[PDB]
């Protein structure tokens, strides 16, 4: 968990969700629209996403 | 050979045990917790997805298994291995780790046992999927009918990491 | 082979809740958008179904 | 018959008595736990659709009933005679089993006792959707009002099998 | 006369404290040939025990267990006298054969319809197979009588030893009464 | 031989007051050598001790530790009596050899279902288990029998020292029984 | 009358653990000639039984029965003397015939309204009731007076012969009054 974990998978979109507020805020700049992420599927394979929208609140 | 086996490592839920024969491997005494450890790092790492403990059976003698204990102690790994001292106690080997998924806690991480009659009795009435046997070792007694077994034929860990997925080369 | 259950029945979409995540990781490559399912019907009796849509999360 | 008898046997919820002449099926003694094993692991598997319980009345003495308990007892099959020794229990064998529905428990799967008076008594006042005669068994002194009686003829348990569509072939 | 419930007083209190807790594992072993009116009053006693130490659904999550020193099918007589009286117990016999799997087993328990399957083990044989059923063990074993007790573990099991002849002490003892 | 029950009771009193909060840290250094039947009656006096003291998850926080003044040896024989009574206790001996940090754990709890990783502490009397119990000192310390406690840091610690030769004289004034 | 007073006090507390039972069976075999000024004290004795042991619609749910030895039609003045008093009996009797589904009706509550469609069964003491109490049976059976109690089912029945003269001496030992 480097950055963060999937909380809800779907064929149409994935929510990852950061662990903490300083992980989050040491990558920023990782983490912006448009930039890559890799979810791991097991335990030798990934999967390679392109971040689609962020949300940092609602709690 | 790594080929073939890197189907059924790559499923998270999935039962897995090893017949690890200390002769075989040299520096086995001193690198046996390491190799414990980084099969753990990879394989027994989640706390969600990997809701199997892995089982380590070794022919030896049931007196060279507390130093084992004592180095995975040291090093700071949760292990249970059904021993008193002498004495075999069948409840507290077949039982479930408990979890605790909010501060990532597990009771304990892997089953280090002997090769007795009682730790194979054991094994027979919970029965994995994948046996894994390193060294020869006779098994015979254990009713492998319905596990995939797999003898592997190795000389050193490096082998044995390559060979699980757990090093790019030798 | 035992997926799951369902929970929902209707003439248009039949909703099904898998068992555990373990059965569901077991045989996620047959769990796809398109292909087919059979869902029991009384004693003897199956219906074919085809999957439309796919969600799990663990909130 | 058969390919008329799929009818009200795919339906879950409803009640079918089977009244049972044995010397009339060959191997009956060493066959009859096994038919309703494999009678029960097909039409009482569901938790929460088979709401109704099988009832198996044979055509024997009072005894002999607790030999068949014992032989359900060996197989993990929970079943009900009424009988407690040779006394029979009205309330013990119209009880409605309790069932648990996020476990699997069921207090017993079927009921069966001998051709008494006593329960056929009791069968009216609790009657059934379809009652099945094998062999050559008096029907009298059986309420038949809503009751579609299916009178069948077999020889040995295969024949059973093959016409309750619990094998496709012989 | 005033003599003997005085001294009983005492065993009375020696035996309150171990008798409040509402989840304790209790086995009697109770010799049939030494209280007076066994057959008539047995289960009476049972069914009194049941309402004061197996009544509440919630709290009462242990099951008694009554091993008598009789013969199989005196066994057979008390069981039928139970189901007449509506209370549900298990023995173990499906005949003249002991089942293993059957006496060692956990009720069931729904709390919406306060029912517990079996409220009591009433196995009233003192048989080389039931006393190898130290598999579980229980916290306190109570002799009622003077039975053999050698094949039984007493080994880290509290020995509670009562000396009595009518089931009214036997009460008094077990805290159901307070007169004698 | 009369006027020793006074004695008790008077002590038995002292007691009381700090043996009602809920939320205690107890140590108990005995010697086996003074309490008579020790090996038969151990491990039933601890069940008995828990079974009031430490049974209530969400109230009786902290564990108990338990010294005993003999060998790593006897620790082993009592840890598998222990065990096949069902009670979880941690020595830190890991094969006569101790861990420091195997014996400060702090156990772990799940509300939901009522279990906790281990119930008490029972280790033997080394120079390196004494220095352990001084980096966490003790709300309350009780001393039977006459075992030194030189080496122990009393500084601002609560010291009872208990008179007795029998199990019962200790549950007595640890208010577990009401006679005696 | 001190002596008399002494020995009723100590029956009195011999019932008691099981009056305190919420729900429980309690049926009473009721001689009126052995009871001064029954015909104008019944009623109210049957009015302040069921204002404690019948007042309590979630608790108290067992209906109490009583069995007298009188006519039927010195019955139905009871039961005209009930209905006016705004208390709900059945007698089982629709005429001068008996019915056995008339009787064995277990009452309907709504807990929200506080109402039960009777509160207690009151009838004579005809062979036609005694299959009915045999039918059930009761947890606790009274008997006041010399009736003869041999056509019903008394094994494994509780059966409490209370000696008595008056309604007073009654309610002390059901434990309804304090003083007598």
């Known amino acids: 968990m480097k950055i963060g974990s999937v909380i809800e998978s779907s064929p149409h979109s994935i929510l990852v969700k950061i662990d903490t507020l300083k992980i989050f805020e040491k990558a920023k700049s990782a983490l912006q629209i448009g930039k890559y992420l890799k979810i791991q599927e097991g335990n030798h394979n990934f999967v390679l996403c392109v971040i689609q929208n962020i949300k940092i609140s609602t709690d | ?170």
């Not at chain 2, 897995?16 to 390491?34: A, G, Q, S």
């Not at chain 2, 909010?102 to 009795?121: G, H, L, M, Y």
């Open chain 2, 1 to 170: 050979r790594k080929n073939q086996l890197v189907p059924s490592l790559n499923i998270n839920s999935r039962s897995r045990y090893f017949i690890i024969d200390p002769d075989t491997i040299d520096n086995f005494d001193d690198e046996f917790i390491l190799f414990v450890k980084d099969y753990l790092d990879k394989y027994n790492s989640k706390i969600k997805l990997h809701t199997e403990t892995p089982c380590f059976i070794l022919k030896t003698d049931v007196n060279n298994l507390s130093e084992y204990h004592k180095r995975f102690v040291s090093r700071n790994i949760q292990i249970i291995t059904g021993y008193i001292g002498d004495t075999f106690y069948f409840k507290e080997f077949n039982k479930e780790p408990k979890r605790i998924i909010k501060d990532n806690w597990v009771e304990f991480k892997a089953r280090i046992s002997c090769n007795s009659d009682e730790v194979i009795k054991c094994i027979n009435y919970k029965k994995c999927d994948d046996l894994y046997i390193v060294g020869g070792v006779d098994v015979s007694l254990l009713d492998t009918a319905d596990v995939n077994i797999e003898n592997l034929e190795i000389n050193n860990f490096r082998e044995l990491k390559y060979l699980l997925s757990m090093l790019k080369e030798i």
